[PDB]
Amino acid sequence: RIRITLTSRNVKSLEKVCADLIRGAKEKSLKVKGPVRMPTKTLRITTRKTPCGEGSKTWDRFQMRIHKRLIDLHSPSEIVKQITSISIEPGVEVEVT
Amino acid sequence: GRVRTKTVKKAARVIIEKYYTRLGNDFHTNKRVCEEIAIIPSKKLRNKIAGYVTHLMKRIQRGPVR
Amino acid sequence: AVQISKKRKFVSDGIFKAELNEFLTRELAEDGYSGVEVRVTPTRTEIIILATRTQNVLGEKGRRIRELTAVVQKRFGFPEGGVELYAEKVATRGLCAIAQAESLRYKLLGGLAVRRACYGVL
Amino acid sequence: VKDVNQQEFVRALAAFLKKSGKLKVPDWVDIVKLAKHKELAPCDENWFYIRAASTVRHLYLRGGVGVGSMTKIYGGRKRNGVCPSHFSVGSKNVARKVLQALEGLKMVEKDPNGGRRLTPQGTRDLDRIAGQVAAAS
Amino acid sequence: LMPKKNRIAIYELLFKEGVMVAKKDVHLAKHPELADKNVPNLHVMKAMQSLKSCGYVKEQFAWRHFYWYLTNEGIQYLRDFLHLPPEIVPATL
Amino acid sequence: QSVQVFGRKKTATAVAHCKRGNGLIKVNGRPLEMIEPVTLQYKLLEPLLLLGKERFAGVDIRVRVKGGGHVAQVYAIRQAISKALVAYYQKYVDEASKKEIKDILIQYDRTLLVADPRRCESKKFGGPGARARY
Amino acid sequence: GHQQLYWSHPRKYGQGSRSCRVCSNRHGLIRKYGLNMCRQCFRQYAKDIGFVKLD
RNA sequence: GAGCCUGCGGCUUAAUUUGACUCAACACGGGGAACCUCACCCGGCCCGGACAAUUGACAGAUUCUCGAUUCUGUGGGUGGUGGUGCAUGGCCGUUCGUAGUUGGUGGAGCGAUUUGUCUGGUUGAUUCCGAUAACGAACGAGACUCUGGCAUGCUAACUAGUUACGCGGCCGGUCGGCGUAACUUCUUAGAGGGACAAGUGGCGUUCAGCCACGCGAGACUGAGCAAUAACAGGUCUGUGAUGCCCUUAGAUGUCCGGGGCUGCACGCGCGCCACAAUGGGCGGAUCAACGUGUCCUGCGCCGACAGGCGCGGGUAACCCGUUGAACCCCGCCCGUGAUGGGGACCGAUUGAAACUAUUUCCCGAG
Ligand SMILES: [Zn+2]
């Protein structure tokens, strides 16, 4: 069995390649496990706005979304090589195992 | 702060003059008409429009609005 | 290997996207540089470059395009042939902010006029 | 050990371990201050039997603890006087000398996981005391 | 105070590929690209500094690093110093 | 053959499992009448003395609580044992009594059946808490 | 010689052992998430790296 | 106000480590001061050195050796925590997030300009209604965006769990640990719903709305982005942002152990109880959450505490971790008292290095 994870930065492009992967896999009559929704991790960086000591203690709250989706697949690796080459888009990282 | 803006005032009036028989005195039925007729990228804005149309319909059946 | 964690992988990616952006805005700012788009794919890292004029960036037989390919592979640690750079020509550059920002900057550095150059891009 | 007063249970279970004088009861650790965040020594003379009964009680509830997490259970608020009071672990040696004492009584087992669940005899003696305190009320 | 044997390793490597990248740090022990020798970082940033002042190389920078490119004139200067025929050509050109 | 109804305080989520027995009211294995906050003893016995002793004799509910604090878990228990009981009267019994138990709980305390939407809002800079400003 | 006294101080720790990877400054450094850049410059590349303000 | 922790004047004089002093100065410069690096202070190795001669040096606070395109081979190549933020940009604060600006056409005036952009009601709002020589729109406001409150409805989960009966002790009941059967209440995150002044009553140019009741997860809130602009309000000490000037090889980059953590009284903000009595103590008992982790830390030896040693997990919903958090809850002790109140001032660990205690702990200390 092969477990391919999907770690991305945008949710709109994550669920797109995730749905395009399971559709490209279920059409080959393969046992695909459901998309596991890993908890998202935000990257908080509270930086002072002004590059000096003048201000009213105004801070800048930054964030960065990190979404991970797990996809398992029990099938030979020869049938999954071409499937991994059709759902590749910028913003999402593919980790085949 | 229950006062609508010009985006809700104008849209709720142009939707009645083009569609009067469509909208009744129910907000939930009027809410579904705006989905098929108008194109709005927000859901909270649609409820404000359909909500004000319901207020206008009570005035229309009562008399001619100004 | 180092087993880069995801919290430090996205940051290491975003810095490579930012450092390559600043290096090209200081080098390709004359040919109308507008940005780059990366696609992290193993053994084939296609790094496209968006410029307004790409015929001069190529050269006689692709001389300047070979340097930048050999420039980032030595600073960021890319193997031989493991990185591929492509040059694309954008359209309607009037909608690109940095394209019009560098446009009138190269004309305001001569002290000609600040009202003619501004109205020229408007 | 539940279904009864957990405070009256350890008050009754400590008296059980006192009658059976088979614990370790170290020579010097039984007369020192218990935790770092504490101010003075425990006012009770048989304090080692009270924490012993409390130690088997927590192992009856949560297993695989070990002496590393036992000091977190008996942690408290440390008085810094002028600095803000914080939380600190209780004591590592007190938990170590009280765990090895129960292993001598065949109540706790050792494991690479650390301080595994109570022995069938350790669980046996706990419910017996739990039944006596229920009948007393 | 720069030796001669390292001068060939820094210029021939810059000849086979017209790109030389060095990090701006005057306290670095050894250059990453110059691993077979013990060439310090000073012998990479200062020996290349004389090429720019004489107009033999073009430099670029991203906050820590130099991006050197052998100009057409600079390659002619290195064709006689490195003792190579006029028929060979670098990889970048 | 069982209903699991959760009770949510600030963070304490208490899910109650509903079964039928002969006078057994325990939470997390421990008996409900012997929880640490002896002060809040009647708060746990609140759905007992106004709902009916004979109507509460043939019910066995075991609650599992996690999160929140001490007092938040107390109000999460009474929120679990009350809603999970009404859900049993409405799913396995008739609604004639399911509304009878519903009316006696509401007339006494609404938060006994409706969770509070109150949560700890995000802190802002420039002050110690949410609104205060040092 | 001079190779045993110049820059001989250990660089293992301290505020000067590390600096910004952009401005080379040693004040307001952000050692979080492997940024290793001063705070006054992180605001300039917050959008380029991906730390956009979703708030 | 009390002791104390830091910040800035004032003093000190190797220099007390500089800017910024109403709002919009004083835990600010993300600056909680051992070295760094520190701009200040004083001593020195030093071409780890160039656009048109040895670097050393056991002998010392000088004897001689070797390398063999870089030596004032003879007026400019350059460095920047050095000045100028009353020369600047970029950013930021503030006015002020108070709600305010602009165009066309038409009207008034010779014209600059004015009307629109308004008496009133309402709204947080130039938000609407209404009025009206103005009409119609734009920016802002709002909408929007991420958050939180519910959805037993859906999409899925051995990197999240419950629930069903079986090997673990007690009295099959009653409580725990160990294994792959059903699906998702609990957990996570995707899609899509839900809340609009919609319903009733009352008050209102019966418009704009407002108020009270229901039903209901709420009659609903907390961020973000934030206009025409202005200030001589800060930033040259955040930048290979920069102009110019000063300083530029006895050096206005370092660096060596470091000196710079400094007091007769006044000032801010902040932690800590007092004026035990609602508190300190001791022993129970029992519940979080965001966030981080190549460093977080789990088990076993042993210190009283602070530590130390070997063995391990975790680049993470996988390990820490079911994050056994404190206050609080319960039992006992203390008691017209500067008391068990108050915690001021007088062995280990980190590193190359703590003296002017870095922190930590022990006893004393009041
Ligand atoms: Zn920087």
DSSP states along B13-50: HHHHHH-SSS--S-HHHHHHHHHHHS--S-HHHHHHHH
Contact status, residue B51 vs residue B40, Cβ threshold 8 Å = no
Q: Resolution, in Å, please? A: 2.4
- Give the nucleotide at minimum CA-to-C1' distance from B65: H207
Contact status, residue F63 vs residue F15, Cβ threshold 8 Å = yes
Strand partners, D87: D77
Radius of gyration for the alpha carbons in chain E, expressed in angstroms and rounded: 13
Q: Rounded distance, CA A96 to CA A89, Å?
A: 15
Please identify residues in chain F, positions 39-98, with a C-beta within 7 angstroms of any atom of strand H. Answer: 39, 60, 62, 64-70, 72-73, 83
Strand partners, G27: none
Nearest to A8 by CA among A62, A60, A61, A71: A71
Q: How many CB pairs under 8 A join C and E?
A: 40
Nearest to C34 by CA among C20, C58, C18, C52: C52
Identify the sign of the CA torsion D10, D16, D20, D21. positive
CB atoms < 10 A from the CB of G24, how many? 12
Q: Rounded distance, CA F27 to CA F62, Å?
A: 5
Nearest to F58 by CA among F15, F88, F96: F88
Burial label, F11 (beta-carbon count in 10 A; 0-12, 13-18, 19+): middle
Provide CB contacts within 8 A for F103, sequence distance 6+: none
- Give the nucleotide at minimum CA-to-C1' distance from G37: H238
> In the structure encoding, which two tokens stand for residue F116, read together?
């509070």
Is B61 near strand H, with its CB below 7 A from some atom of it?
no
Contact status, residue E66 vs residue C29, Cβ threshold 8 Å = no
Strand partners, A70: A5, A36
Q: Rounded distance, CA D88 to CA D71, Å?
A: 9
Contact status, residue A67 vs residue A11, Cβ threshold 8 Å = yes
Query: Which nucleotides of strand H lie under 7 Å from a protein CB?
Result: 3-5, 19-20, 24-26, 28-31, 35-38, 45-53, 55-57, 68-71, 77-78, 81, 90-94, 122-125, 127-130, 138, 141-150, 152, 155-157, 159, 162-164, 168-171, 173-177, 185-191, 193-199, 207-210, 217-218, 222-225, 233-235, 238-241, 253-257, 269-273, 280-294, 297-307, 315-317, 320-322, 324-333, 340, 342-344, 351-352, 360-363, 366
Contact status, residue E66 vs residue E52, Cβ threshold 8 Å = no
Q: How distant, in Å, are the alpha carbons of C69, C118, E31, F32 from that of C74? A: 9, 40, 12, 70
C-alpha distance from E9 to closest chain G C-alpha (Å): 23
Q: Rounded distance, CA G17 to CA G9, Å?
A: 10
Experimental method: cryo-EM
Contact status, residue D98 vs residue D55, Cβ threshold 8 Å = yes
| DSSP state at residue D118 | B
Contact status, residue A61 vs residue G53, Cβ threshold 8 Å = yes
> In the structure encoding, which two tokens stand for residue E67, read together?
């991006």
Q: Which residue has the tokens 């942690």?
A: D75
C-alpha distance from C62 to closest chain G C-alpha (Å): 29
Q: Rounded distance, CA A72 to CA A21, Å?
A: 11
